[model samples]
Structure formats: C-alpha cells, structure tokens
Target: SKTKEGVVHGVATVAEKTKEQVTNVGGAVVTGVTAVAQKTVEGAGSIAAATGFV
Candidate 1:
C-alpha cells in the first residue's frame, strides 16, 4: 500500500497495520476494555442482589 500496511478485521482471521492509526486506537481500545470490565462486574453483582433478595 503506502509507506506501511493497514489492517482491519470484520469476521475474519487476522492482519497488520502501521503508523498513526494504531496510536489513536489505543485510547478507544483501553476505554472499551475498562468499560466492559466495569459493566461485567456491576451487572453480576446487581443480578444476584435483585434476583436472590426478591
């Protein structure tokens, strides 16, 4: 391609990329991972409380 290769997945195997793309993506990736962890733990606790107590 250009100076480096670009990689994007959509129900596929794998690929690669280079340059500024990965830099910006790091933030969103971390945020999503963190959010998932937060949601998962909270949901588990809430489910048990609501279902078991009532």
Candidate 2:
C-alpha cells in the first residue's frame, strides 16, 4: 500500500532526524522533546504524503 509505504518512510526519516539531532546536540535532556518533534514531523509527513502535499 502506498499509504503504508509513505508512513514507513516518514517514520524512518523522523527516526533518522531524531538521531541526528540527538547526536549533534549531545544532550540527554532534550530527548523527550525531540521525540515529540520527530513524531509530529512524521505525522505531518504522513498526512502530506497521503494528500499529495496539498
């Protein structure tokens, strides 16, 4: 399914982004917030991908 594939891609991208942020920032304090941000991004990506970014 295209939607599932988009969701998976979005999730993977978000995880990669989160990891990059954590590694670059070198801060355990922001882990929780970063996770939230990553999830939000992935969610938005999923929605946008589903709607053709319209």
Candidate 3:
C-alpha cells in the first residue's frame, strides 16, 4: 500500500511539473511571436514609405 501511494505521489509531482514547464514555454512562444509580428509590421511600414505608398 505504501509503495502504491508513493508511486501515485511521484506521478502527480511529475505531472504538475510538466504542466508548469509547458505553461512557461507557451508564454515564451507568445512573447517571441509578438516580437516577430511587431518587427514585420515595422519592416512593412518602412517598405511602404520607401515606395511612397504611405
């Protein structure tokens, strides 16, 4: 019984840690995407200005 309980507890701990790591990675991905989008917009604006479209 004790061994079963220990195994369950270990699994729960690992699951929780995995969840936290995934969340952290998700947030980083969002930040990176946002940065790239902003840069893309800026580049487009520059091109438009150069083309006298803006």
Candidate 4:
C-alpha cells in the first residue's frame, strides 16, 4: 500500500537525517533503518495479515 510505502520512505529519511546529525556531532548514529524497518514491516505485516480489507 502506498500509505505503508510513504511511512517506510519517511523512516528512511529520518534515519538518514539521524545519521547526518550523529556524524555532525561526532557520535555514531548507533541505529540504522533496520529497527525502523522492522517495526514498519511488522506493522505492515499485521495489516496484511488481517482478514478484513476494509
């Protein structure tokens, strides 16, 4: 779904921003899109697993 796609894209953007910020601060971002992507995937997976499409 486009909604999920948008959310994922937003997550990516945020992750990138975080990376830049961490870099500027001379600290590791320590986290990547993996966690965010995991959550997004889980949320989308639940939606897809639902029986109702409405």
Q: What's the C-alpha lDDT at position 18 in model 4?
A: 37
**Model 2: per-residue lDDT, tens digit, 1-54?**
544322323333334443434343432232342223224544443321212222
lDDT of 2 at 3: 42
- Residue 42 shift from truth in candidate 2, angstroms: 19
Task: Name the runs in model 4 displaced over 4 angstroms.
Answer: 1-20, 23-29, 33-54
Q: For model 3, what is the error of residue 35's alpha carbon versus the real structure, in angstroms, after optimal superposition?
A: 1.4
For TM-score, candidate 2 versus 3, the one ahead is 2
Q: 30, model 3: CA deviation in Å?
A: 6.5
- 1 or 4, greater by lDDT: 4
Error of 1 at 48 (Å): 24
lDDT of 1 by residue, 1-54 (tens): 465233333444333662333355323322211112123434443322212222
Error of 1 at 25 (Å): 16
Instruction: For residues 1-54, write the lDDT of model 4, one tens digit per residue.
Output: 544442444333333333343443433334333423334544444322313233
The candidate maximizing TM-score is 4
Q: On lDDT, who's better, 2 or 3?
A: 2
What's the ranking of the predictions by lDDT, best on top? 4, 2, 1, 3
Model 4's C-alpha root-mean-square deviation from the true structure amounts to: 13.9
Best by lDDT: 4
lDDT score for residue 18 of model 1: 29
Q: Give TM-scores for every candidate, taking all chains together and pairing residue i with residue i.
A: 0.13, 0.12, 0.11, 0.14
Write down the lDDT of every candidate, Cα atoms only. Answer: 0.31, 0.32, 0.26, 0.36
